[PDB]
Design a protein around this ligand. Structure first.
Ligand code: HEM
Ligand code: NA
Length: 153
């Protein structure tokens, strides 16, 4: 797993996110949909959107990004002990919405990019390696649940 130091650095930068969660949700999702447009097809409410200006104007997108970052903060705050938090998330991402593990890799990279961009002072090298590991652990444990659920992610 991660060390105490690695978790502490994860949780430090997450406090920056939580100081404006909607702002962060919007930029992560815009980074995701612009880098990997096939991911936007997953979101029926706003898959019709084409430009970053449309994306920024969208209340629905802002709302979903807040829900996503809020849930990830919940997981992260457990520092690995996130069975209860991961369970319903694996379940909906393997059944209701079928989210490939590759797309979880894209949004992880989007998070890391947005954090480096907005919080260089709380996100230098060590901190980046630690968030890298925390999101790898998240994706690996979600994959293990996907298998159980009958979804080849
Ligand atoms: C950091 C990784 C992610 C976290 C913590 C996360 C979390 C969540 C949460 C808490 C919800 C709402 C409740 C639920 O259905 O369980 C949600 C909904 C959703 N997520 Fe995920 N998510 C992640 C990544 C992704 C990715 C990469 C995609 C698609 C490429 C995606 C697609 C969806 C869709 C389509 C919904 C339904 C949204 C709606 O209400 O219109 N998620 N996610
Ligand atoms: Na531990």
């Amino acid at each position: 797993g991660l060390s105490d130091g690695e978790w502490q650095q994860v949780l430090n930068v997450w406090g920056k996110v939580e100081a404006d969660i909607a702002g962060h949700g919007q930029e992560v999702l815009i980074r995701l949909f612009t880098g990997h447009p096939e991911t936007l097809e997953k979101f029926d409410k706003f898959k019709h959107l084409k430009t970053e200006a449309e994306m920024k104007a969208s209340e629905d997108l802002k709302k979903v990004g807040t829900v996503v970052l809020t849930a990830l903060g919940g997981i992260l705050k457990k520092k690995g002990h996130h069975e209860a938090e991961l369970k319903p998330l694996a379940q909906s991402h393997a059944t209701k919405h079928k989210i490939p593990i590759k797309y979880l890799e894209f949004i992880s990279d989007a998070i890391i990019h947005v954090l480096h961009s907005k919080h260089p002072g709380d996100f230098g090298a060590d901190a980046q390696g630690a968030m890298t590991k925390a999101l790898e652990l998240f994706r690996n444990d979600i994959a293990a649940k996907y298998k159980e659920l009958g979804f080849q992610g």
